[PDB]
Structure of Genome polyprotein:
Amino acid sequence: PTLWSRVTKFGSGWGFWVSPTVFITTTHVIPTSAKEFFGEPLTSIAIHRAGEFTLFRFSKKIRPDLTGMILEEGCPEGTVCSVLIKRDSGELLPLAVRMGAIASMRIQGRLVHGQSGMLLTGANAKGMDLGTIPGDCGAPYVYKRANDWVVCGVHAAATKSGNTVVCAVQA
Amino acid sequence: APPTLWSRVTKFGSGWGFWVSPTVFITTTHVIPTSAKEFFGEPLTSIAIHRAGEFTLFRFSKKIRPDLTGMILEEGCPEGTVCSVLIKRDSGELLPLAVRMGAIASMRIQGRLVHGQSGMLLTGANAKGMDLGTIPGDCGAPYVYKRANDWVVCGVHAAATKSGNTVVCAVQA
Ligand SMILES: Cc1cc(C)nc(Nc2ccccc2)n1
């Protein structure tokens, strides 16, 4: 049983299974030409979109092996989350991120709305596995609270250089 | 982390070890099978074993891994270095866990006395457990970092605290 099995390749990025019927992803990674996802006709899928956050609700159990997890609209300011990055090499890269305010941020000359964060893996990556790349979009932000895992949004954007990431949130 | 570093990470006893070169293999002392008299088809007589607490180095008299180039092994790393711990998990999943390294330390963990280079995981806030932190089966995994153009190995995974936020790298002496 693992959080990592819920992280799924999707479109030009990734998404996350909250429950057997609920999948979350970043809006800009979703295909714009499709009649089905995960073998289910698009006719039978409810799509709920809020800026860079999208939630799919399926009419049957796609992932019956999973329990349902707590999904919230962001997290309290100062919470340290993990972004659960999968790479096509087969690497799993959990990175600590300190979450800040909900904001409109200028990220490579474009406006992105969501919960700001700062990577805690330090000055740079180099060739080291310490930062995000554009193909990581849709990876989930998670943290542990009491005995429960909480999912609070999806990876939407990052500055090419610095420290700053945007986590798109529900509602 | 480069494929050539993952290729050197080898399942061994109750954990792992790592090929520095075609003749040199390093691991954590407590993962070695205690009754073993043969390694990679070679008897004990043809191997030079150098043990310093939880760090063990095996030097073979023939080339076991001729596919490999020899790389740099150092005695830990500067304080503040960020390393990756190259951990293999159930099913060809590769977990290069980020760790900020600190001072050489003597600690008591689950009653055992442990000595090596301390570090703190950079994977999340509460790293107890297998999704963001280490498990006992990870002992012997290598600590590596990139220094300008090349990669360095600076120890092997020896222990983690009950909270899982602190780890100890056993180092060559
Ligand atoms: C940069 C910074 C400032 C402050 C106040 N807290 C933290 N938290 C932290 C850092 C690494 C791992 C886990 C938590 N980080």
Observations:
- Residues 1-68 of chain A form one domain.
